[PDB]
Amino acid sequence: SMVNSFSGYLKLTDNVYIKNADIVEEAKKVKPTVVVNAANVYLKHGGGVAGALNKATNNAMQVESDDYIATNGPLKVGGSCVLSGHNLAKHCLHVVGPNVNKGEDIQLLKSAYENFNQHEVLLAPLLSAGIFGADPIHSLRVCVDTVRTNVYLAVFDKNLYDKLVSSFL
Numbered sequence: 001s002m003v004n005s006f007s008g009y010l011k012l013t014d015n016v017y018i019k020n021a022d023i024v025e026e027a028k029k030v031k032p033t034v035v036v037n038a039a040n041v042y043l044k045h046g047g048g049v050a051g052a053l054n055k056a057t058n059n060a061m062q063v064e065s066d067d068y069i070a071t072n073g074p075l076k077v078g079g080s081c082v083l084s085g086h087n088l089a090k091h092c093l094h095v096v097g098p099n100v101n102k103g104e105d106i107q108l109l110k111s112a113y114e115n116f117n118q119h120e121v122l123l124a125p126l127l128s129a130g131i132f133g134a135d136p137i138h139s140l141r142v143c144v145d146t147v148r149t150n151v152y153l154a155v156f157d158k159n160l161y162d163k164l165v166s167s168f169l
Contacts, residue, residue, distance in 0.1 A: 004121065005030050006152045012168060015150050016143060020161035023049060023125055023154040024056045027088035032152075035085055036116070036124035037061075038132065039094035041074040043081075048131040049156075057086040065094070077104050078111030093119060100133030109139065113146040121150045130156070140164050 009017035019026070027035045038049035043065035045054035054061040064083055075081060080095040097112040098104035112127050126143065128134035136155075143151065155161040 001150060004150075006032075006123075009152055010165060012140075013144055015148060016153065017151070018140075018153040018155060018161070018164065020158050021154040022052075022156065023123065024052050024088070026123055026152075026154050027053075027085075028056070030123065031089060032085075032121065032123040033090045034093050034119045034122045035089035035091075036122055036127075037092050037094045038125050038127060038130070039075065039080075039096050040099070041077060041079075041096055043069055043075070043094060049125045053088065053092070056088060060084075060086050061092065078108040080112075080115040089123070093122065095127060097128035097132055097139075098134070100128070101131070106134060106138070109134065109142050110146050113143055116143075116147045116151055117149050119149055121152075123152045123154060125154060125156075136160055137164060137167055140168065 009019045011017055037053050045051055045062050075096050077096050077098055080093055083092050085092045095112050095115050098106055098108040109128050116122055126136050126139040129136040129139050
């Protein structure tokens with residue numbers, strides 16, 4: 001594969017890399033072609049990764065997203081759309097993982113990760129982790145077993161990062 005500027009990642013597999021990092025700061029530094037947002041179907045970027053990415057864009061992500069929804073309607077759980085990356089990336093891939101706090105079926109997590117295969121290289125969070133309520137160890141497993149393109153995972157919490165690495169098979 002071609003050399004790229006992602007730095008300090010642990011290599012998990014042929015195509016999956018992981019780092020304890022703030023995805024906002026990572027994106028600002030690297031300016032990747034694609035940053036993944038942990039979106040919901042309404043593209044309401046209130047909290048978690050989405051709230052942080054949107055805040056870093058000075059709410060431009062939300063303004064763009066509101067126009068997207070007005071034109072196209074909600075996304076599907078497991079679905080995605082490509083919008084601007086604003087000051088963070090060329091593009092933002094908004095991906096909707098299932099929210100366990102909404103009762104959504106965890107099997108949709110695989111469908112959510114399949115969206116990553118449409119992009120050769122991505123900076124991403126673990127889908128359905130954090131406030132979406134899924135087990136991040138499971139999310140990492142689904143990622144490795146689903147994504148075939150090159151994915152650089154940013155894990156917000158240091159303790160969780162260490163547990164993901166130390167439990168990885």
